[PDB]
Design a protein around this ligand. Structure first.
Ligand SMILES: Cc1c(-c2cc(Br)c(O)c(Br)c2)oc2ccc(O)cc2c1=O
Ligand SMILES: Cc1c(-c2cc(Br)c(O)c(Br)c2)oc2ccc(O)cc2c1=O
Lengths: 123, 121, 120, 121
């Protein structure tokens, strides 16, 4: 392909410590025709707060995806009590054509922001 | 005064105004692991939605508040990223309290927040 | 209500209103310098109710200063930014009500504005 | 680990894309209150800005990152609320570090986070 290897990427940040959130469980699902959620993939954010090798352009077909982020375990391990059980992000993909995605989440015990930076890989 | 324990405040980051008539729907977790409806409603003119529950009815358990942020953005002729915004939390496990969910929406982003008010005694 | 300018601050770590946060509001003078406009600290509710009036709140640029540094330090948390500042032009397109909101964490903060309208 | 001492990244919450061509001016406070110009540039196609300063030049002191967010929106035909966005922090006091100021933008809102990390050794 071109420059990048993976179409779906997730980046998580820590607002309390101002550092990448490492070892955050991430699990993706895909709403199958019946409306059911098929286990698409699952990884753990590396030392850079990023998660690579989730899927390939061929496996990442069109449809509605669900990205779950176990933010609860993250905070517990630290000694903090968080409000949310987990951060979930639901979006439709490759509907426009076939592009690259980036999900970014910012963590805080009682709040979190998620942002998508969708980019056309061919322009 | 906080009559109800659950109140949802929504805003719009691209217009500097409260997000009105946004679809909010709370689900609660069942003993077998299901999600039975708990409340429903749409945000008023001030972005706020209250009277969803009552202390009596809003008891311990895992809750899931869902906002139809998508059909909100589309009414403005904008094609958003998210299908919806969803906040899941374990309510009143530490005893009876009052919770405020605050959302700040944008076509490709959103932040949510919890303000756990402690009851007067 | 009668309050044109209002500021609401929230703590994202504790998950409660940000109390005792010093706020100083400045107005830009025709001279081109910032003249002290208003001042106060967040109440229990996290908001600052009653900064100015619909009379004294004339049109022009306004600088809002939030002292998050002192806020986080009292709690023994060394924060990042020296403070959080918000600058905007007010009323150059109508006499409306401004609400500056702020959600705080040690290494990150967020601000948003709600410009309402004097209805009836 | 971050290679560049101080890097700035800007995003557009509306288009869900990098905020390109945003002007960034950095200043350092002088021993007498003054605000001398330190470095400037504009965000590339990636939304991030590279080449602000080396470690030798990035001494201990207060610094302010000014982003002309107003111009970005006007060029798009939108009228923003803020005049600009400033992030004012103290750098290299607890030791020499590598920073990254990130800002998410919207016509009426902006959030900004910092990512400090100990330089490669
Ligand atoms: C503006 C605003 C916000 C707010 C501000 C920012 Br910045 C955010 O990122 C988020 Br998310 C929510 O939260 C509230 C919570 C309770 C309440 O009673 C009123 C408000 C309110 O008025
Ligand atoms: C998306 C994004 C964000 C980000 C996401 C959300 Br949601 C926010 O509310 C804020 Br504030 C910042 O921060 C970064 C910080 C350092 C870096 O190297 C890259 C990034 C990045 O790519």
């Amino acid at each position: 392909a071109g420059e990048s290897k993976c179409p779906l990427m997730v980046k998580v940040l820590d607002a309390v410590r101002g550092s990448p959130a490492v070892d955050v469980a991430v699990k993706v699902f895909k709403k199958t025709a019946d409306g059911s959620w098929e286990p698409f993939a699952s990884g753990k954010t590396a030392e850079s707060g990023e998660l690579h090798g989730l899927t390939t352009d061929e496996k990442f077909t069109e449809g509605v995806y669900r990205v779950e982020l176990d933010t609860k375990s993250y905070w517990k391990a630290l000694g903090i009590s968080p409000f949310h059980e987990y951060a979930e992000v639901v979006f439709t993909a490759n509907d426009s054509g076939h592009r690259h995605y980036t999900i970014a989440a910012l963590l805080s015990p009682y709040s979190y922001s998620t942002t998508a930076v969708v980019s056309n890989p061919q322009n």
